[PDB]
């Protein structure tokens, strides 16, 4: 039912650091502000990522997109049936988010979620990257993906698949030591191999990282050098086993939250079949202190 991940809002301790990070390093286009939130663009949408001041230094909310008004009412019906509490966004919130309608709720573990429809687009103000990146792969696959940390993956799974409609792509057992392994579950709601992954990681954040997909391999290669100069690289270039995303990781100005910048992943369709992997790295991705 949820069609794609449309936007993300972060609450951070260092807004100037995040602004420079998202523009100069990542390459997003600065798009003014909405309230005390600075807006950033990656394409034709009026905004894709919002950054506001806050002690959380974590993801503040995530916008889940449906294709129309009826679809949003159908989501409200699903929440209602599942017994999930939610509130309809008032006019002010609709204006602030620039959407035609939205339902505000939370996943089982505190992450505020906003199901919305009718987002604002500004084709008369063509996207202009702040750094050398040819463009981002969004469109029907949404803004990208993120790894949601959860204390109970089974509980999280039930909510995301059963209530929100996400579908399991595959699982990767992430070695967390000699005799410790965490089964990460990758979920899709469209062509993107996964829009949200659930993992029971021993981390104090709502998410482990968010990912943006660039158009070319050079986009990623150039990006790595930009973030290396910032001294934020956390991983060498690599390619994932399940989605085949070729990428590198880097720290955001928010401690323990990373960003993944990749290219050329595999996409999913109806014929997709669930599989299991023992490693997240097909090759590369060597961790960097």
Note the residues at the interface with a second copy (CB under 8 A). Answer: 3, 65, 67-69, 98, 100, 117-124, 126-129, 131-132, 140, 168, 171, 217-218, 221-222, 224-225, 228, 236-239, 241, 246, 271-279, 281-284, 286
Task: Report in angstroms the alpha-carbon separations of 287 from 203, 235, 283, 284.
Answer: 17, 4, 12, 9
Site string for Fe ion, 217-256 (x = CB under 5 A): ----------------------------------------
Given the complex with a second copy, which of 203 and 217 has the nearer CB atom?
A: 217
Residues 6+ apart with CB under 8 A from 261: 26, 211, 212, 214, 219, 220, 223, 224, 227, 247, 248, 250
Tell me how far apart the alpha carbons of residues 3 and 67 are, in angstroms, rounded to a whole number: 7
Tell me how far apart the alpha carbons of residues 193 and 216 are, in angstroms, rounded to a whole number: 18
Which of positions 195-214 make contact with Fe ion (CB under 5 A)? 211
Partner interacting with residue 224 (select from a second copy, Fe ion, none; CB below 5-8 Å by kind): a second copy
Shortest separation between residue 262's beta carbon and Fe ion, angstroms? 7
Residues 6+ apart with CB under 8 A from 180: none
Partner interacting with residue 260 (select from a second copy, Fe ion, none; CB below 5-8 Å by kind): Fe ion
Tell me how far apart the alpha carbons of residues 232 and 133 are, in angstroms, rounded to a whole number: 18
Given the complex with a second copy, which of 21 and 117 has the nearer CB atom?
A: 117
Tell me how far apart the alpha carbons of residues 239 and 236 are, in angstroms, rounded to a whole number: 10
Cβ contact 223:217 at 8 Å:
no
Shortest separation between residue 199's beta carbon and Fe ion, angstroms? 11
Given the complex with a second copy, which of 65 and 260 has the nearer CB atom?
A: 65
179 annotated among ligand-binding-site residues: no
Tell me how far apart the alpha carbons of residues 22 and 40 are, in angstroms, rounded to a whole number: 8
Given the complex with Fe ion, which of 75 and 172 has the nearer CB atom?
A: 172
Which helix (H) or strand (E) covers residue 31, if one does? strand 29-34
Please tell me whether residue 170 binds Fe ion under the rule CB under 5 A. Answer: no
Q: How many residues bind Fe ion (CB under 5 A)?
A: 2
Given the complex with a second copy, which of 54 and 284 has the nearer CB atom?
A: 284
Q: Which residues contact Fe ion (rule: CB under 5 A)? A: 211, 260
Q: Residues marked as binding for Fe cation? A: 145, 209, 260
Tell me the binding residues. 145, 209, 260
């Amino acid at each position: 039912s949820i069609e794609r991940l449309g936007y993300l809002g972060f609450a951070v301790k260092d807004v100037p650091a995040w602004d420079h990070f998202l523009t100069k390093s990542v390459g997003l286009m600065a798009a003014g502000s909405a309230g005390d939130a600075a807006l950033y663009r990656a394409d034709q949408r009026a905004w894709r990522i919002a950054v506001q001041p806050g002690e959380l230094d974590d993801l503040a909310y995530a916008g889940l997109e449906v294709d129309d008004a009826a679809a949003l009412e159908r989501m409200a019906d699903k929440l209602r049936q599942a017994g999930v509490a939610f509130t309809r966004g008032d006019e002010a919130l609709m204006q602030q988010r620039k959407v035609m309608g939205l339902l505000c709720l939370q996943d089982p573990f505190g992450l505020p979620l906003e199901i919305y429809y009718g987002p604002a687009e500004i084709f008369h103000e063509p996207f202009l990257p702040s750094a050398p990146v040819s463009g981002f792969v969004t469109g029907d696959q949404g803004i990208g993906h993120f790894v949601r940390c959860v204390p109970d993956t089974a509980k999280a799974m039930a909510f995301y698949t059963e209530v929100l409609g996400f579908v399991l792509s595959d699982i990767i057992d992430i070695q967390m030591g000699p005799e410790t392994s965490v089964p990460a579950h990758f979920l899709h709601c469209n062509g993107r191999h996964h829009t949200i992954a659930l993992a029971a990681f021993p981390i104090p954040k709502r998410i482990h990282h968010f990912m943006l997909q660039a158009n070319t391999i050079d986009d990623v290669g150039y990006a790595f050098d930009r973030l290396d100069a910032a001294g934020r690289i956390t991983s060498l270039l690599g390619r994932h086993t399940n989605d085949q995303t070729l990428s590198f990781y880097a720290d955001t100005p928010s401690p323990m939250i990373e960003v993944e910048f990749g290219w050329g992943p595999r996409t999913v369709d109806s014929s997709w079949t669930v599989a299991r992997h023992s490693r997240t790295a097909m090759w590369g991705h060597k961790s960097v202190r």
